[PDB]
Short mmCIF file of C-alpha atoms (C1' of nucleotides) and ligand atoms in Angstrom, two decimals:
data_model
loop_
_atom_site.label_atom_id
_atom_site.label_comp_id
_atom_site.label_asym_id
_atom_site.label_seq_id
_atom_site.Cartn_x
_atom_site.Cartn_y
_atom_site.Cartn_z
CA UNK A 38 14.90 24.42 1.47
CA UNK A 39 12.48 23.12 -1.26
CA UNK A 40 10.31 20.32 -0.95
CA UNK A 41 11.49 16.71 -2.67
CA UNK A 42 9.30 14.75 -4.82
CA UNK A 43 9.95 11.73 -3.05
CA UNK A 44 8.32 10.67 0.39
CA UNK A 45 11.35 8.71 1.47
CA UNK A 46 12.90 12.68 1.67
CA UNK A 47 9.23 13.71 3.70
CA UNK A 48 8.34 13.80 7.45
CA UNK A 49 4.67 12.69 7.12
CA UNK A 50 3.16 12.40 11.03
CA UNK A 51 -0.69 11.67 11.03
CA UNK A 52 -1.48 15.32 11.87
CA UNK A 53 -2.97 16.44 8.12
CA UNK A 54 -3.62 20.40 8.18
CA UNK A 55 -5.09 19.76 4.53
CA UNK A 56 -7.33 17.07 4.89
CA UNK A 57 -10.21 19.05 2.78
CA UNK A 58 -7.36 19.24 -0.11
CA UNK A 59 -6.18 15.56 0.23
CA UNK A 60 -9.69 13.93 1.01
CA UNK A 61 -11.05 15.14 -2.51
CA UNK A 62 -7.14 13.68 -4.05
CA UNK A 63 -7.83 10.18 -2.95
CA UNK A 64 -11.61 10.38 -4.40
CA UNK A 65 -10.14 11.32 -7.51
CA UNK A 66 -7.14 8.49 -7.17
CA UNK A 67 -9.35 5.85 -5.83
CA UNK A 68 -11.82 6.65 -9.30
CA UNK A 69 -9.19 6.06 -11.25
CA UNK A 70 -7.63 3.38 -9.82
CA UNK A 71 -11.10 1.04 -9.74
CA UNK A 72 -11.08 2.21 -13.80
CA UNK A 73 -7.04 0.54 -13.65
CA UNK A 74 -5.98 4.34 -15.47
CA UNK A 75 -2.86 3.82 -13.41
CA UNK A 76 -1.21 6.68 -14.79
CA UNK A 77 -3.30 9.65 -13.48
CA UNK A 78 -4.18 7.73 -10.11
CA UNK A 79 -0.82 7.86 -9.50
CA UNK A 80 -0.52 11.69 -10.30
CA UNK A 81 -3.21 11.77 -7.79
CA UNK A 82 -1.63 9.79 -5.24
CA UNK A 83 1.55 11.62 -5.00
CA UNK A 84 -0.32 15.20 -5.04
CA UNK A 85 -2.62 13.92 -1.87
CA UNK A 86 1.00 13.08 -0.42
CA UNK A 87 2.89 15.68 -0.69
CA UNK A 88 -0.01 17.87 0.87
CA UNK A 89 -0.05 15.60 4.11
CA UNK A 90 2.95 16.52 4.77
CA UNK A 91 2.57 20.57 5.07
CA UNK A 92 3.22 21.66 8.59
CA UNK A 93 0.41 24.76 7.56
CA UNK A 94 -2.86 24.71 5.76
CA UNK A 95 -3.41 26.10 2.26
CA UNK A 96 -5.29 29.44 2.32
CA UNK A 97 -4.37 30.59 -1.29
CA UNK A 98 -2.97 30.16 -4.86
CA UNK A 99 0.58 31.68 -4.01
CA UNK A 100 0.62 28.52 -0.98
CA UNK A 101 1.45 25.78 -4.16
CA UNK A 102 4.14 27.88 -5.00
CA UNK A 103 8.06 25.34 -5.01
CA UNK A 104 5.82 22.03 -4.21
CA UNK A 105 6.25 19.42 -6.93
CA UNK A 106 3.25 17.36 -7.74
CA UNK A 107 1.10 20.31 -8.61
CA UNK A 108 0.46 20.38 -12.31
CA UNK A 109 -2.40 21.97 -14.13
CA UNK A 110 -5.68 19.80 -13.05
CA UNK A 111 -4.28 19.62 -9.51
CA UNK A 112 -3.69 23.45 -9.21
CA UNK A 113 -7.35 23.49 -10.33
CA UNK A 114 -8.45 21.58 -7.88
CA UNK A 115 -7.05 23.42 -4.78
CA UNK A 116 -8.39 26.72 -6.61
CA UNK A 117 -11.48 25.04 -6.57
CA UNK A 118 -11.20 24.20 -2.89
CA UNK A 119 -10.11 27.29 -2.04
CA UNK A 120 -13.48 29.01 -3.60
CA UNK A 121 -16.34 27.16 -1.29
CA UNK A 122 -14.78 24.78 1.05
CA UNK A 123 -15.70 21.94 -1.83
CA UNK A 124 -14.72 19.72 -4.84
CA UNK A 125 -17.31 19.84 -7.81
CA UNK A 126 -14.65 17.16 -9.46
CA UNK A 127 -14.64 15.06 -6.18
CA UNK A 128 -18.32 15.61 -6.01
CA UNK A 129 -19.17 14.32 -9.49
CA UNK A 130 -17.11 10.75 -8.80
CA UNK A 131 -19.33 10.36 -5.30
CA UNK A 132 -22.26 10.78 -7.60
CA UNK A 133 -20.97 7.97 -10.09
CA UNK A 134 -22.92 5.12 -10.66
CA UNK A 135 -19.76 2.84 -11.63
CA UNK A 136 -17.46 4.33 -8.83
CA UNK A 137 -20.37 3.68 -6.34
CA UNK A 138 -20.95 0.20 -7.27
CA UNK A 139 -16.86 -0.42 -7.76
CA UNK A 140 -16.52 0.91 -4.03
CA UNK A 141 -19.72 -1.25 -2.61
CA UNK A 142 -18.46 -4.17 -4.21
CA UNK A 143 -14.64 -4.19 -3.49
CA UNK A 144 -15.87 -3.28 0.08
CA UNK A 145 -16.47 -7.55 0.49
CA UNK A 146 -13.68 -9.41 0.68
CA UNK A 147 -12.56 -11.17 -1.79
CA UNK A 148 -13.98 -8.98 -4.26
CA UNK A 149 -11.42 -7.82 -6.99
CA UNK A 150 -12.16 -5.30 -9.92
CA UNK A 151 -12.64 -8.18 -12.45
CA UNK A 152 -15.40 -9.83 -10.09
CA UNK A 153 -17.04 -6.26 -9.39
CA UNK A 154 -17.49 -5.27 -13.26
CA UNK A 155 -18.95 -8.74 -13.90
CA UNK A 156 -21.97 -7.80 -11.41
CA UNK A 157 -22.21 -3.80 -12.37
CA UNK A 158 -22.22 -5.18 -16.00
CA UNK A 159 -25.21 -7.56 -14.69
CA UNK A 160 -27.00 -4.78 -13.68
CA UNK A 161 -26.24 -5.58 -10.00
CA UNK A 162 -25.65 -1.89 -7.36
CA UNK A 163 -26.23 -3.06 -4.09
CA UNK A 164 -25.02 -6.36 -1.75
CA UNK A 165 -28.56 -7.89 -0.68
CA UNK A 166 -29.27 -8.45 -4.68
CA UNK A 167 -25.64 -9.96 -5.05
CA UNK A 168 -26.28 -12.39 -1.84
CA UNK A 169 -29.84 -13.70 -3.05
CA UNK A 170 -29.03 -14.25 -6.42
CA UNK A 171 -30.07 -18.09 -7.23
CA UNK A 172 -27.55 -18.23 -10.13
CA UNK A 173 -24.26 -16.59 -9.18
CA UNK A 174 -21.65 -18.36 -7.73
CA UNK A 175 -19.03 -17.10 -5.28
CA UNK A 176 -15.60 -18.27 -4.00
CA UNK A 177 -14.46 -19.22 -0.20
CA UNK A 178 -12.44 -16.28 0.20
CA UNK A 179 -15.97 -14.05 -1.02
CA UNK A 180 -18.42 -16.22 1.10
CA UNK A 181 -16.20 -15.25 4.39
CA UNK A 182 -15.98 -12.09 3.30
CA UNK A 183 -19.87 -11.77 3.17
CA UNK A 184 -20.42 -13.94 6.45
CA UNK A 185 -17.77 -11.53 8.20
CA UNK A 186 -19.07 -8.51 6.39
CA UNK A 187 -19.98 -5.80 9.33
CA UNK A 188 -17.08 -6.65 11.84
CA UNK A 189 -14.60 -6.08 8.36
CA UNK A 190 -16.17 -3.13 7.37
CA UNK A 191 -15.76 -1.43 10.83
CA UNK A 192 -12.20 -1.42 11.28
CA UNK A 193 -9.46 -2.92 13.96
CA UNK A 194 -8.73 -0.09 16.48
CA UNK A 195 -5.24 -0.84 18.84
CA UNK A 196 -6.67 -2.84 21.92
CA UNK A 197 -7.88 -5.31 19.21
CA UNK A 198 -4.94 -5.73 17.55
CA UNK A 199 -2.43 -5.91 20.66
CA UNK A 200 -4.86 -8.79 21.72
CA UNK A 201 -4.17 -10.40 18.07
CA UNK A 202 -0.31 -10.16 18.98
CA UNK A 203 -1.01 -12.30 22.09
CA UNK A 204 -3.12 -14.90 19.78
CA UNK A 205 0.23 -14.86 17.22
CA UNK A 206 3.00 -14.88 20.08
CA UNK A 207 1.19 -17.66 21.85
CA UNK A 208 0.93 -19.76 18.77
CA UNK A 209 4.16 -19.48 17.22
CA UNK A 210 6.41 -19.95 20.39
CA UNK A 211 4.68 -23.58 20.79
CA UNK A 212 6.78 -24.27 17.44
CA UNK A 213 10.00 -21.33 17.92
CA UNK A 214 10.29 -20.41 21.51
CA UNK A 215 13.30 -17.92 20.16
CA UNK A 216 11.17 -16.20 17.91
CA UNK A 217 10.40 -12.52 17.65
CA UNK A 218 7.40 -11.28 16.60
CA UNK A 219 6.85 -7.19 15.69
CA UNK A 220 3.55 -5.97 14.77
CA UNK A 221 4.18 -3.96 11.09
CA UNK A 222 1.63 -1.55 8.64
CA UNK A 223 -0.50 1.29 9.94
CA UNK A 224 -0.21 -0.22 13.30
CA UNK A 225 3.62 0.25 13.96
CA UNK A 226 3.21 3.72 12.30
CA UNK A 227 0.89 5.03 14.92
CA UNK A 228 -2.18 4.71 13.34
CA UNK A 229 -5.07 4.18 16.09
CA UNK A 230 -7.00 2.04 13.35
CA UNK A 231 -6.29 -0.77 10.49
CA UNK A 232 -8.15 -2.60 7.84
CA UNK A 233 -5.96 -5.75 8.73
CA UNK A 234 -3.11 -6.13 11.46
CA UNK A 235 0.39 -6.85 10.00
CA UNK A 236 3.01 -9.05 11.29
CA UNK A 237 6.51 -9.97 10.41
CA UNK A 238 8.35 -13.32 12.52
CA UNK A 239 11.84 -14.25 12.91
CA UNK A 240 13.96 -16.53 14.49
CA UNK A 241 17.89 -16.57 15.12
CA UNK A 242 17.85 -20.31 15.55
CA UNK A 243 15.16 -21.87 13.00
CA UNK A 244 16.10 -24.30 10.04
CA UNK A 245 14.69 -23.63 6.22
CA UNK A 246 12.50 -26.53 6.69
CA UNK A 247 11.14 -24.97 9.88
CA UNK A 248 11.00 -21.39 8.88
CA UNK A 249 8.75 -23.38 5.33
CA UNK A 250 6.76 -25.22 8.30
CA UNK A 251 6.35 -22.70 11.34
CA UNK A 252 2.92 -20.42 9.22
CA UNK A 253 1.79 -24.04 8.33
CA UNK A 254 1.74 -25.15 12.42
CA UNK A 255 0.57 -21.47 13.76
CA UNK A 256 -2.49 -21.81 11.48
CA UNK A 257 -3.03 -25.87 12.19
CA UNK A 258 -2.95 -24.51 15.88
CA UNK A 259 -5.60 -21.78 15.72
CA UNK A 260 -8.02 -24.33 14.12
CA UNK A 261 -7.45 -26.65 16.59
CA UNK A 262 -9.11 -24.06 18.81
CA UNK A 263 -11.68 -22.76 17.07
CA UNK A 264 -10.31 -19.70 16.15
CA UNK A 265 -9.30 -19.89 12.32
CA UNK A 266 -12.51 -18.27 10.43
CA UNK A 267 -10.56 -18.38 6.89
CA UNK A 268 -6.86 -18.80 5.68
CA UNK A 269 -4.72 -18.66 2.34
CA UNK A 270 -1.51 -18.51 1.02
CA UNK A 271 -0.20 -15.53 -0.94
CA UNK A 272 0.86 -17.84 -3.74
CA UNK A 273 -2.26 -19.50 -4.70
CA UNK A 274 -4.03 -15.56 -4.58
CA UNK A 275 -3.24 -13.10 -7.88
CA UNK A 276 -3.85 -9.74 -6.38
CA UNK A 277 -5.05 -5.83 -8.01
CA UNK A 278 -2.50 -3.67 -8.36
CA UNK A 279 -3.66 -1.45 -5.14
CA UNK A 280 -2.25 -4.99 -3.16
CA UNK A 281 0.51 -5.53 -5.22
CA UNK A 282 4.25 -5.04 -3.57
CA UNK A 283 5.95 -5.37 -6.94
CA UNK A 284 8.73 -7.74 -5.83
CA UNK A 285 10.84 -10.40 -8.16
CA UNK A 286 9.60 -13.57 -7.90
CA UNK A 287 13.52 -15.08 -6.80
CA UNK A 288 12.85 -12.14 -3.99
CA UNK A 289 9.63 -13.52 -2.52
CA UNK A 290 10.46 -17.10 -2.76
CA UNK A 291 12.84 -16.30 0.25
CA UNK A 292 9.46 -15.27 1.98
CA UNK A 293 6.66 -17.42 3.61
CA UNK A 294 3.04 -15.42 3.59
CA UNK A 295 -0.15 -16.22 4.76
CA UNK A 296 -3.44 -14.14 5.38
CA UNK A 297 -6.26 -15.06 8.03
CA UNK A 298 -9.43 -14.44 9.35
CA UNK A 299 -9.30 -14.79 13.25
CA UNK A 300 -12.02 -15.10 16.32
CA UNK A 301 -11.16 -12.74 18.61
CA UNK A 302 -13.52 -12.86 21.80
CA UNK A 303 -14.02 -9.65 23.42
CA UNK A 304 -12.57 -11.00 26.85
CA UNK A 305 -9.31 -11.00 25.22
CA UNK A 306 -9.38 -7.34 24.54
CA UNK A 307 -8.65 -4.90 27.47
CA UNK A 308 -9.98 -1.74 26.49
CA UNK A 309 -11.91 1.70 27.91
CA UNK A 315 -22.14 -7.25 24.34
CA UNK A 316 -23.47 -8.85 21.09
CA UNK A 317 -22.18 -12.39 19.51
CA UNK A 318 -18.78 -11.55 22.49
CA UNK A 319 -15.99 -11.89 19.81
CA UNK A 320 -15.32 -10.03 16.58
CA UNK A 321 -13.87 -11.28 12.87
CA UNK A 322 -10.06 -9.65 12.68
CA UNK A 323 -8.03 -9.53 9.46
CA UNK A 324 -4.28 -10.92 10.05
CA UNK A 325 -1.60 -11.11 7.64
CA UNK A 326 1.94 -12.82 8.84
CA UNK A 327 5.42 -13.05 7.43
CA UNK A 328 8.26 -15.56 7.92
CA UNK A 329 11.50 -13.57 7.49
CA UNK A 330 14.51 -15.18 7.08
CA UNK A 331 17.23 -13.72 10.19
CA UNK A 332 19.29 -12.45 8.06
CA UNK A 333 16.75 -10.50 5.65
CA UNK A 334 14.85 -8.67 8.88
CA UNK A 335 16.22 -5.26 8.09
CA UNK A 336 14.65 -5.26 5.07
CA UNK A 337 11.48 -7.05 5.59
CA UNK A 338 10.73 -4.52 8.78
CA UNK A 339 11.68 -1.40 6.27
CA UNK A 340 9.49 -3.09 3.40
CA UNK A 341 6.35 -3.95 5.80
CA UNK A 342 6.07 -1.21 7.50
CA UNK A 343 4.86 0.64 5.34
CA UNK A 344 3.21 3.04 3.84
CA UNK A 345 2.85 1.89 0.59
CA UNK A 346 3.64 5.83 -1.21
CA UNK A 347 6.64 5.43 1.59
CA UNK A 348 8.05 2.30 -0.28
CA UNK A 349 7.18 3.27 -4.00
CA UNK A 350 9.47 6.51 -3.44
CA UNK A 351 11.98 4.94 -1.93
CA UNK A 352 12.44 2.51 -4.04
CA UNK A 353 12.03 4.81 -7.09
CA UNK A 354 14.66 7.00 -5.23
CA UNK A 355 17.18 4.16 -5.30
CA UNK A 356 16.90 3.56 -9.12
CA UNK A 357 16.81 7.34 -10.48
CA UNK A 358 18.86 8.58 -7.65
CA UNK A 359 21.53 6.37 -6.90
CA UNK A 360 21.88 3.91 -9.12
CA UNK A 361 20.46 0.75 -6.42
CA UNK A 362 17.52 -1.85 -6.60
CA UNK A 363 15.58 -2.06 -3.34
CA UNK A 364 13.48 -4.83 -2.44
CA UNK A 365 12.21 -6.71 0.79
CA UNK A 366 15.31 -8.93 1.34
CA UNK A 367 17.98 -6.54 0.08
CA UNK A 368 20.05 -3.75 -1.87
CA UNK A 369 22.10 -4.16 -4.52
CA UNK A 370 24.12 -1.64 -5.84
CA UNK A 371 23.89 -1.72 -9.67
CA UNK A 372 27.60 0.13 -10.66
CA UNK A 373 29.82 -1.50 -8.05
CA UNK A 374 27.55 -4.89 -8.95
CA UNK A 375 27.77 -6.11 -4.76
CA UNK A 376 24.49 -6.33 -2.34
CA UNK A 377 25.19 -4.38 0.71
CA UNK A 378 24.76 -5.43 4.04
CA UNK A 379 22.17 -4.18 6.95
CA UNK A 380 20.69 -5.23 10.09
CA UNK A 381 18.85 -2.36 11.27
CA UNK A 382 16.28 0.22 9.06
CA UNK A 383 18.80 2.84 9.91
CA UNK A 384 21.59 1.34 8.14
CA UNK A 385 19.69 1.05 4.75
CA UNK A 386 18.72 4.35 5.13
CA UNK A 387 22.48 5.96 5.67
CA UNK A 388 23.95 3.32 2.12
CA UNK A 389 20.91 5.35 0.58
CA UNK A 390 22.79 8.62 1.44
CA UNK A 391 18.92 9.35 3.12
CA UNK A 392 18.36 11.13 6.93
CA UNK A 393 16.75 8.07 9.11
CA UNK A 394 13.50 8.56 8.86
CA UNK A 395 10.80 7.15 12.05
CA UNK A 396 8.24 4.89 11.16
CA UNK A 397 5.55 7.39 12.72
CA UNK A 398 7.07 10.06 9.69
CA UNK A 399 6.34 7.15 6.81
CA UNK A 400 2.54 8.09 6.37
CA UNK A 401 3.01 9.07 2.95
"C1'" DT B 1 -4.91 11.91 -22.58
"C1'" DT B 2 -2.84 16.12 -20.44
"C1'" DT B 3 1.56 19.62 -19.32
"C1'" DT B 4 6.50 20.28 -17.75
"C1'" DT B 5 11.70 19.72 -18.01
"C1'" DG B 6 15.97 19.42 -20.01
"C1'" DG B 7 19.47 18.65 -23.39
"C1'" DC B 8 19.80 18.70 -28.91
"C1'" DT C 1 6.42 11.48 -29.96
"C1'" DT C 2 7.57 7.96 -26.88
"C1'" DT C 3 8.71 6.28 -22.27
"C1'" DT C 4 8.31 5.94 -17.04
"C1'" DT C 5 5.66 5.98 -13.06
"C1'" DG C 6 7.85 0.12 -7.01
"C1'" DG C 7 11.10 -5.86 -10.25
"C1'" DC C 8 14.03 -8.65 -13.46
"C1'" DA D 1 -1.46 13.48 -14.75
"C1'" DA D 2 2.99 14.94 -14.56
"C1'" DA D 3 7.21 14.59 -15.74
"C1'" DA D 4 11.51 13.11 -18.44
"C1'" DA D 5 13.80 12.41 -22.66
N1 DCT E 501 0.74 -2.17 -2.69
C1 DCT E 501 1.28 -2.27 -1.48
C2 DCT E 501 0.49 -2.71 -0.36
C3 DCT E 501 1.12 -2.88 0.82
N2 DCT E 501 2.48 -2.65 0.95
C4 DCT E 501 3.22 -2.87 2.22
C5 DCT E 501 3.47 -1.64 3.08
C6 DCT E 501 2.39 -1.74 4.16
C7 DCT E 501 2.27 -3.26 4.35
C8 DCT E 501 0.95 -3.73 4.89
O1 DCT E 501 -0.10 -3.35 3.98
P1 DCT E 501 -1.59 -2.93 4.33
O2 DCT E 501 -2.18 -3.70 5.46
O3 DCT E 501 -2.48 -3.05 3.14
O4 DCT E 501 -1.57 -1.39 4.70
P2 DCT E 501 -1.34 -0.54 6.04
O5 DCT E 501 -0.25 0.45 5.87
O6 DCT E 501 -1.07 -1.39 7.25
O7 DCT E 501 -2.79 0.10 6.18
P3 DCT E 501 -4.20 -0.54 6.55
O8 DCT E 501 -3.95 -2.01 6.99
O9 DCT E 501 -4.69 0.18 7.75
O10 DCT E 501 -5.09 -0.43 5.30
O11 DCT E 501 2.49 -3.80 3.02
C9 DCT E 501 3.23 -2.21 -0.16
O12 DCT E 501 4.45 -2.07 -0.04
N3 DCT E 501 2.59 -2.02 -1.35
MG1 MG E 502 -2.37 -3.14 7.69
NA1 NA E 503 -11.76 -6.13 -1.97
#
DNA sequence: TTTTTGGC
DNA sequence: TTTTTGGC
DNA sequence: AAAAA
């Protein structure tokens, strides 16, 4: 009957009934989290999440009554809300002159919070400034992200990124012609729109020298026709805590990553004229056969999905979840899946779909 | 930097 | 009062 | 921020 804390023990569909409650929540997480009080932003986080998944909207007080995540300054909040449709909290952070600069800044890729204190501390709030400046200097990964800036900013609707998985399929059965490739993130969740599009490859028959080779060929293959606008490896990168997956470094050694920029011409996308192609963020994974249960699960997403259930496994039953396996911490053995549904049931959790993980 | 919870 | 909040 | 201990 009452509502868990966790979102792995949640039904969260994209259909929000208290998007005026949960749109001030992630103002008030996302101010924090640019000022790294990871604490609070969390607080925030999981009170926006909980709220998404309400199958009514809050009309009063005696609404928060049996849902966890509410303490005092969130109760005040959705009083506040309540009251004249507004938050006067939320409305004070859009008015901030370091969250507005923070939120400009990290808008460009490539920018981190370390880079986008340096120029607010500079004096620096807006991006023509930043671009003309004859003295600062900028990295690759920043200099696509200014070059690429308006097709980034607007984001990657479906058509686009179901004519990425054609650019990915093509590419990577010229090296593994056994190889399956399933689209991950927002994307496999439902979502109509994504900042990036995610992908996750495997193949039944590959080698470990060709599963360490096959990103290295996809990519050599893209540039050979034109189409690679920027890559990197997720080695050589050191990401904020917002990109983070918190794995053990023994744990993503098993994994090959890589994250693009692509070309994607607009007679490749069939959908309801300008330059006639558009800049698309891509980020792949080589998953070992074995490990795809887990890599699909840990991909997929979202992010407050994974947290909980991974916090679920520790406080609740005694595991340690990651994105090649689950070990069982009392009986000291890993146990073994190969389907989402299967980790899910040695959990002791109801199978949740991937359209019910937008936590 | 706050409050809540649950055994001592 | 100190610790956890997705890893060891 | 809000638990947990
Ligand atoms: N800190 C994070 C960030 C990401 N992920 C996982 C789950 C989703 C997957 C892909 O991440 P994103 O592309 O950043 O997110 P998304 O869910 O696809 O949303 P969007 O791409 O639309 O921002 O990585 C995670 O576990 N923890
Ligand atoms: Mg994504
Ligand atoms: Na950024």
């Amino acid at each position: 009957k009452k509502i868990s804390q966790y979102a792995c023990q949640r039904r969260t569909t994209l259909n929000n009934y208290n998007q005026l409650f949960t749109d001030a929540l992630d103002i008030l997480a996302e101010n924090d989290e640019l000022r790294e009080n990871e604490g609070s932003c969390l607080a925030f986080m999981r009170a926006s999440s909980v709220l998404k998944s309400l199958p009514f909207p809050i009309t009063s007080m005696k609404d928060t009554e049996g849902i966890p995540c509410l303490g005092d300054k969130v109760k005040s909040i959705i009083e506040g809300i309540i009251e004249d449709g507004e938050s006067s909290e939320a409305k004070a952070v859009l008015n901030d002159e370091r969250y507005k600069s923070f939120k400009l800044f990290t808008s460009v890729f490539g920018v981190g919070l370390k880079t986008a204190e340096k120029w607010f501390r500079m004096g620096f709030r807006t991006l023509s400034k930043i671009q003309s400046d004859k003295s600062l200097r900028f990295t690759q990964m920043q200099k696509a992200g200014f070059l690429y800036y308006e097709d980034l900013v607007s984001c990657v609707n479906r058509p686009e990124a179901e004519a990425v998985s054609m650019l990915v399929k093509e590419a990577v059965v010229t090296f593994l012609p056994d190889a399956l490739v399933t689209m991950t993130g927002g994307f496999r969740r439902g979502k109509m729109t994504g900042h990036d599009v995610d992908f996750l490859i495997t193949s039944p028959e590959a080698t470990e020298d060709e599963e360490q080779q096959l990103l290295h060929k996809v990519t050599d293959f893209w540039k050979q026709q034109g189409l690679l606008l920027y890559h990197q490896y997720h080695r050589s990168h050191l990401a904020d805590s917002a990109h983070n997956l918190r794995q053990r470094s023994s744990t993503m050694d098993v994994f090959e990553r890589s994250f693009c920029i692509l070309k994607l011409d607009h007679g490749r996308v069939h959908s309801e004229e300008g330059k006639g192609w558009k800049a698309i963020r891509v980020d792949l994974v080589m998953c070992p056969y074995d490990r795809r249960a887990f890599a699909l699960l840990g991909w997929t997403g979202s992010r407050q999905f994974e947290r909980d259930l991974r916090r679920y496994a520790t406080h609740e039953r005694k595991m340690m979840l990651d994105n090649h396996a689950l070990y069982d911490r009392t009986k000291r053995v890993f146990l073994e899946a190969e389907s989402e549904e299967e980790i899910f049931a040695h959990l002791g959790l109801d199978y949740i779909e991937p359209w019910e993980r937008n936590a």
